[PDB]
Chains A and B, each alone.
Chain A
Amino acid sequence: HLEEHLEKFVENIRQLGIIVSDFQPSSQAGLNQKLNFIVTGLQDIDKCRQQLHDITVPLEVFEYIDQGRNPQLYTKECLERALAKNEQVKGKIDTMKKFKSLLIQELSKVFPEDMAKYRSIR
């Protein structure tokens, strides 16, 4: 929440500081370093806010961030693996359904009275 906007303002101040210290400056460019230290202090306040927030994140998010993609791709892949497991399990249960139907067909062919009493009892 607020940690995002705070660290974003910190990163933009860091970029402006890199731009200013990249350029020769008559004005006291120590204000850039002071704003960087104040951003570190506000990040400590945001770390208190992160103790308030208590986010738990898996490591593969960190690793896909290392690959430089969206973590949204990790969300799509977790959703895709969920649907892959659900597809496989529904397919196994569907083959068991077809096999049970075939078995009761063939046993009703070969044993009439017994499968009749079974279809009665169910």
Chain B
Amino acid sequence: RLSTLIEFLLHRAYSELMVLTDLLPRKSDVERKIEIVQFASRTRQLFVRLLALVKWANNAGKVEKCAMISSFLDQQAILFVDTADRLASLARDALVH
């Protein structure tokens, strides 16, 4: 899923840069430098959060195993409650009649 997010991030970055380059000659150049460094801050934040993602990409498989563990233990808890539930449905419904 990170490939799709990487492509979409690169696309939105290139498109916003295209809009910035289109307004670059249009904008007043002195304040346009300020708008350029604001856009550079935008791109730096996008890229550093992608850097955090590709850092965590080593730690992805352990979280996959943790999700497997959590699903398994939730299943066994539902087994305990289902056993108690079926015993209650025995003791209060079928034996009374």
Which A residues fall within an 8 A CB radius of B? Answer: 3-4, 7-8, 10-11, 14-15, 17-18, 21-22, 33, 36-37, 40, 43-44, 46-47, 50-51, 53-58, 61-62, 65-66, 70-72, 74-75, 78-79, 81-82, 85-86, 88-89, 92
B55: shortest Cβ distance to chain A, in Å? 7
Instruction: Let me know if B54 and A78 touch, CB within 8 A.
Output: no
A-B contact pairs, 20 of them (CB 8 A): A3-B54, A4-B51, A7-B51, A14-B40, A21-B40, A43-B6, A44-B10, A55-B60, A56-B1, A57-B5, A65-B52, A74-B56, A74-B63, A75-B56, A81-B66, A81-B70, A82-B66, A86-B73, A88-B77, A89-B76
Question: Is the Cβ of A21 less than 8 Å from the Cβ of B37?
Answer: yes
**A8 neighbours in B (Cβ, 8 Å):** 51
Mark each residue of chain B from 43 to 57: 1 if its CB lies under 8 Å from any CB of chain A, else 0. Answer: 110011111111111
B89 interface residue (CB < 8 Å to A): no
CB pair A89 B77 closer than 8 Å: yes
Contact A18–B3 (Cβ < 8 Å): no
- B86 CB to closest chain A CB (Å) equals 16
Inter-subunit contact A51/B3 (CB<8 Å): yes
Write the B20-37 contact mask toward A (1 if CB under 8 angstroms, else 0). Answer: 010000000000010011
- Is the CB–CB distance between B6 and A3 below 8 Å? yes
Q: Which of A37, A53, A56, A82 has the most CB of B within 10 A?
A: A82
- B33–A7 touching, CB < 8 Å: no
Contact B48 A57 (CB under 8 A): no
CB nearest neighbor in A for B46:
A11
Residues of A within 8 A of B36 (CB): 18, 21
Q: Quick check: B54 and A40 within 8 Å, CB to CB?
A: no
**Which residue on chain B has the smallest CB distance to residue A75?**
B59
B50 close to A7 (CB less than 8 A): yes
Contact of B1 with A22 in the complex, beta carbons under 8 Å: no
- What's the least CB distance linking B80 to chain A, in Å? 6
From A33, A72, A82, A92, give the contact of B70 (CB < 8 A): A82
